[PDB]
Amino acid sequence: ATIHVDGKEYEVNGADNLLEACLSLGLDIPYFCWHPALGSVGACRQCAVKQYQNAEDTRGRLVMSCMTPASDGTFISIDDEEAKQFRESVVEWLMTNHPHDCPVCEEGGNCHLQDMTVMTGHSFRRYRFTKRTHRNQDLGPFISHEMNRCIACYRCVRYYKDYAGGTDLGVYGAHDNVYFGRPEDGTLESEFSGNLVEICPTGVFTDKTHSERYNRKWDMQFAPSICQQCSIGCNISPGERYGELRRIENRYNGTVNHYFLCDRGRFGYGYVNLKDRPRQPVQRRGDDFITLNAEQAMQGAADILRQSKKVIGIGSPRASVESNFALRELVGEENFYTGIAHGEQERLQLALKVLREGGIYTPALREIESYDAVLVLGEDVTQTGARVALAVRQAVKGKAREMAAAQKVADWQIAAILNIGQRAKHPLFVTNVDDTRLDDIAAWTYRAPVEDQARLGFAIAHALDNSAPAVDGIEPELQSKIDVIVQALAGAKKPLIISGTNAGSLEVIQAAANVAKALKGRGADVGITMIARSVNSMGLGIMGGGSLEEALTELETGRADAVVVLENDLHRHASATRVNAALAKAPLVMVVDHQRTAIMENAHLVLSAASFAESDGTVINNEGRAQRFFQVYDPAYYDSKTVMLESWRWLHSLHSTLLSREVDWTQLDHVIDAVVAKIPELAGIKDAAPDATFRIRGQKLAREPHRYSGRTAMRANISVHEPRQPQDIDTMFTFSMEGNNQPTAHRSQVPFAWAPGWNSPQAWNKFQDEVGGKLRFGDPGVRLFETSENGLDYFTSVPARFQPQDGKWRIAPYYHLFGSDELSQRAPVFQSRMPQPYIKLNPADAAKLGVNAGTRVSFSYDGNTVTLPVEIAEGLTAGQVGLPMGMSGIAPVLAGAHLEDLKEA
Amino acid sequence: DYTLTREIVTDPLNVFMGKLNDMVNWGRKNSIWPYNFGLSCCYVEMVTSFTAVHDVARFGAEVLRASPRQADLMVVAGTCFTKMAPVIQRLYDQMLEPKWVISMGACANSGGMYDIYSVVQGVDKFIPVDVYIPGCPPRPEAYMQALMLLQESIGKERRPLSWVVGDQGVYRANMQSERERKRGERIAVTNLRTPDEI
Amino acid sequence: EPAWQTRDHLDDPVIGELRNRFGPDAFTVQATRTGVPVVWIKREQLLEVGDFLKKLPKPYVMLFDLHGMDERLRTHREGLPAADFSVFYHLISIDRNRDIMLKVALAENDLHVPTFTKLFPNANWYERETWDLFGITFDGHPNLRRIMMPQTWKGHPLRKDYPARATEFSPFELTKAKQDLEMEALTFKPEEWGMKRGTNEDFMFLNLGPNHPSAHGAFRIVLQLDGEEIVDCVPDIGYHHRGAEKMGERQSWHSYIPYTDRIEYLGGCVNEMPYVLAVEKLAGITVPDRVNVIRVMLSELFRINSHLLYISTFIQDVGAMTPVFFAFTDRQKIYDLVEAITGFRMHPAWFRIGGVAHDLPRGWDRLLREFLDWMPKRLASYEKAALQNTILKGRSQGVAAYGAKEALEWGTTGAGLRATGIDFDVRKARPYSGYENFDFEIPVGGGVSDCYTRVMLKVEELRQSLRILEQCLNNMPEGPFKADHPLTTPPPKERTLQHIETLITHFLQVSWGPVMPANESFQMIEATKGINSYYLTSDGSTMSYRTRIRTPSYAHLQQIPAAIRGSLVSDLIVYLGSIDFVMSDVDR
């Protein structure tokens, strides 16, 4: 298409509206109610341009650019005098009732309304009457509510209801008393409610966790990082002030997590700011806890390790690829152990084998939204991989999108699309042990034990392709549901099969692989998605190693007299009594970690490792994409006594001191080169981000905005002499504003989005090639493996049906977005959001045991009696008991295990 | 409370030795000869203090020697440029004991607004300073106030009377800070004149 | 059409003359808000274009400015040639009352330009500074050494990849530079500085710095002497380099104003004026008449302050030590008025983008009237007591004389240029800030620029500034002290305190900065010591992409060896006292 804006000719996409076409060309049109992810509604009337009928036209007509297609041969004017007057008048109308609140508003300096008020040139007030006011609501611990600042742009309700699928937010009232909020006070129930603080262009919805320790956007130190709270790998911009992690913003990645995070990634960062974190290396001598610097710790650890006969290392899926590799090189490949359990490791390696040997393409998170039918087997996606659940909701609304596209309705005309596709949606079939948060949009939900869900998957695969192994003993009603699923999957151009390791069943993953293979054999464009547990679960699976049980066996038998535990509390993957016994028997325990874990009581040495905010590294997400995260701030800038280094730096220096009795710390790219030289499967992590010599026309990449303040006063109470600016030898970023953050700079790692005149998250428009698309010079991150040329064989081992045995209770895993991830529990804001931990019981089993709802029952696992209250789970199958995985005292390894002597206390 | 140079020590102060030390300190604090050294705009305000409207000669501090040998006070009145820093250090080294240093202005205090590639961030990075004057520039009476502060500091320091007899260490008084001294009268301020008048 | 409008200046006769001489395709005309024709010339045609402009019927006789720009980070380069770096040449024709800016584009690897020193001799120091701060080599230059940074300096500070901030202080580097200071007298080679015949067996060498007990600053001159005669002299400058242009790239448009104060630190609001006028050209702001009169009043008060200091220090340098006390009393009267209006003495930082910081306080006219009654009898007393002294005349008359051609070829402006009979004052030739509404004369000399002639011209300029101040006192317009433009930074304070849109504008203007659309602007004013100019390049951000400050003291200090060669050293001291320079103006 060809458009003419203000006498200049441009080539645009004809499927776009005029607003996104002009914003992609670098033109500045003010807008409020339009969002790239939500479509156009034409509410705020801010995006007015003057459209002419032909080239020789003087009158024209004011039109909404967001509602007008950018068709070929269009003629418009942005800087027309009447259009400018109308846009200024719209801003003026919005300013009539706006409160005098910018100094005490958390959106100040990050406010889209401020930017568009300045952009239209409106600074003179002639309105002299009263301003309407509103009472606020309590929206929970994460979102602060202030309805005075609302401009009634309807973006919150559109995102929360139409996009996110939430139900407890709405618009109430009438003409100018429109109220946006909940029908009553209470916590916002959506797992993606935190994106309201970026969706809302004003300060109505704000980050309450940030508002506690508030600072302005210009005062932040930002870095591009990866969220560490599950395996999805959403790109984030952590921002720090005065030595503490202040905020997590969404960092745009057009391939992964484009505009949206989940609430666990946005508000679960509080463990970084915990006061009990180790800040110096501490050596235990008797009952004394002496504090060492880095060189003394390295020398003492090297001497004690050189005296030992066999030192083993226990990695973790929390740690980055470089730290796990450095531990593996320090202890040797034969002595390196992945810190996860044997069953967890088996499921993880099966998921990796399916992903990189099954011959079926695995989609990125943005690509999930383009699929035609979704079968979720075993994985409670909303509680373990939440952003995949949001993308699945978009893929489900794809049917209404296609139905509207059949009627020549443009993709940005979202109201017409939703009107045409009223309640029709793409098929979604979810299986779990109980109800899920995807059940409202699911075409069918199967509540069954993991063996029965695996059997349903195997039966679906057999019905799609008769070469697959058959399932014997299917009830005719379940057979009819299976035929419904098969007819929906076979008629789909792009089916998607989603499973993962969180179900605790190998057979569920095998069944999902069989369904994907059966759909691939029919010529479908099938995709498969495995949801792993932790941020670097896939990297630890690719690296490999022994299980935690083998390491504990080596410690208990005495063949190993030294253990180095890297960023692992060890209680989530093995029983606590066994771990404590094996660590108490070992004459040397060295724990390299950034969180105060329970195994440090038995540790002879504790190395104060850095968290993700104070470290650089690489993590591999659930789709196999290698992504680099960069250090946000120097921990030693304020507290000069803090010795908190990267885990790979600690382990590389320890290896150097063990070998040559000399301390060499490392450089990060040196460790990257060592990884890609020793482990060829991880060779793609070299291209995840450029090395430390990368420059933009000779200069580094700035971590903080140009107007960063207080540089001669932020540390002036400690000493009036300004300290040396922290050097970054590891990465291309600088710990200062003396760098480049231009939107046109040839790079993929963007620490934060700012452009002149665009201070809000709408500056990401300036950082994209086209608005709502990818980043201008490619999205960061590189897939480690391609789709295999040939696939796997059918998994023959179909499990038998679940049989409730007397005296044994099968543990059904219940995951919680606030409480199952290890480090996010440590965040103090999650305790008010984390549910009180009960145990789920069938009504039949609870009536058999004589227990009601709320009474306390006690059960023993591994010879340890613990007591919990009871809820009655109607959807849970009898013979099973439901437990909240990852909570305090309940390890995720308990999923799929059995329970004894469960009785009322 | 004193600081020793040759340590946080106490007062070493016969009653005739104390009287002789008081006489020497009186003569030194009442005859302070600054070194005529121009760095930047702060020097313009310093020599403004030397003129008739302010008359710093009343304190006996006007002689303004062009030679560092004859000067007792160095006023760093201006920015410490990196090319001028060895010059400043050499001129300070050519001064003879006893010698005192006044940093005048934000540049000499800390680098001021010039946190820049060619400016040393404060003269106390390389030479010791006795009195600091904030301002950009400090007004001439601020320089005279710093001169009186230096006189108070000189008036109760301890230096050897002769180089052949007695303790040769230099004891400098650990003064109470002017901020904590004036905090009582400064916080009690309630109303000021409105800025719409003269 | 407003005065800040973007123009190509294709109606300028120099564009037609260049088109007729070199061809339509030989250059590219750039539309700017500088007010001058900006012409991009090929590098191989630069000397031909300069010669052609030098031999015009009303020729371009003065190289006003010459510097560089790092174009690598410049995003809005529409209508511009491909350039990693660029070198600009600002040339002034006084007979046409016109000026032209030639621009040469340079690739990153090929950073060399032919020298301009054969056409204009002030290109020597200008090209030395361009080499020092940008790394651009000038072929054929007689001595292309560093002029701001020391000789053992790594990198070029005005490049965009050079970090602006102060590095970590090291006592080892200070001790090393002290060792070079002590060994400079032993390892002095008289060829690196551009001299020849380094000891005819009688040419001694003298050093006059870098500890100068005077208000003009501290800088070294190394003198080659035949007895008492100055055979040759080169000045060593850069001892007062503050990186002010680099800070112009590191501060917002509003927060840079106090740095503009400290360029010529005896000037104050006079230094603020060209910066805020150029920013207002970038912003498209036309200030009201009351703003023009207020800024003119403060500029003339500070001009009288600077002239009083200059005359008193010259009289002190001759040997009469008394009038400086009374002159500083008059400076205190001026400072009473300036303290009342702006709250500060020497660096008021009171001008704003779109106006001034506050309204005039009630009762200012009484202080202005008291100073206007105080000044003339004191000025006449200074004249009769020192300026008519025949010993002072014998020290000053005929010392360091030059004519109109020498002043033109060295870029001399101010009283030194006008003492040669060339009537060129910016307040009349290129009027700004409503100077056309005032009745004042421009004093000119007979044709010779002596020390005494320059001093008497500055006395007459002081009297004319008193006349302007009298007109300012009698005719004060009633109106706003800030423009009603949306880019007026900051907005009026009461509307900020009670109106939300004004509060939003203030919030974003003082924090992120006002957003100037991408353009180039230029403002030239008659400062207290000559012609001062700000050339500002905006890339569309809240910070200046390039802040180029042309100061007259640089040109006068470069003119020194051409005017003092063959004189005595006491004559050199008198010449330095009569130049009216400060070293912050030279180095900046």
Ligand SMILES: CCCCCCCCCCC1=C(C)C(=O)C(OC)=C(OC)C1=O
């Ligand atoms: C102790 C005996 C002193 C006798 C007189 C000394 C010389 C005159 C006063 C000092 C002085 C000098 C040298 C001087 O040069 C000067 O001009 C800068 C002054 O005014 C600020 C002075 O006050």
Ligand code: SF4
């Ligand atoms: S929402 Fe924006 S315009 Fe409104 S008070 Fe907050 S910062 Fe100011």
Ligand code: SF4
């Ligand atoms: S609360 Fe925010 S997002 Fe919702 S309509 Fe109001 S301004 Fe828009």
Ligand code: SF4
């Ligand atoms: S979905 Fe996972 S990776 Fe993404 S924000 Fe949530 S916890 Fe972080």
Ligand code: SF4
């Ligand atoms: S502190 Fe201010 S007035 Fe003093 S030298 Fe520095 S810039 Fe000049």
Ligand code: FES
């Ligand atoms: S953005 Fe088009 S009317 Fe709101």
Ligand SMILES: [Ca+2]
């Ligand atoms: Ca690092």
